[PDB]
Amino acid sequence: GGAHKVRAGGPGLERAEAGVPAEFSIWTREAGAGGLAIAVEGPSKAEISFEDRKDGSCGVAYVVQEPGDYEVSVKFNEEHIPDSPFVVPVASPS
Amino acid sequence: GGAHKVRAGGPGLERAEAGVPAEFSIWTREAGAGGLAIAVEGPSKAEISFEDRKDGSCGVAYVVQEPGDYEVSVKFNEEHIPDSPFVVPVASP
């Protein structure tokens, strides 16, 4: 219960460019209430900015600096929503 | 800032063996949001992965293929955590 009811989507969960923000959204509504957390694993640090919007919807953007393969993960009460973690490739600026 | 509230330990921070996955763990729940970085320095490349599980424990595992003296760094928000880097003797199979 809880996590399976959450949904996320965006460009940020399918591909990104080194240096340029990768955005996506999460919708909780229908799940319990508690805590959403987002994590990025890969060959470089990630700057993650977070926004709860008075919509019961939440919006995310992060930056990474190195090409390579990353894993973005969204978790509700410390467990993965459907499709988390998302295998997200990063390529160099054009 | 914040790295001083992070702890690590386990057999992978003490010795390891070539071709054999080596494990240790990190406690972060007392430092909140941030970034971990793990570096492994020495004679050959390492494969590394986190295991972030539903306890809220954080695990690291790595595999190097060559005997020798490696060093495992663990920093949080670019600062070293207590006792990092770690001198890790990696012995033959």
Binding site: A37, I38, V40, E41, P43, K45 | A39, P43
Partner: peptide, 18 residues
Amino acid sequence: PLEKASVVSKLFFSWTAP
């Protein structure tokens, strides 16, 4: 010939508040 060469392997993990 006086250099030290070694291999350096990195992984990172950044995560978020609530």
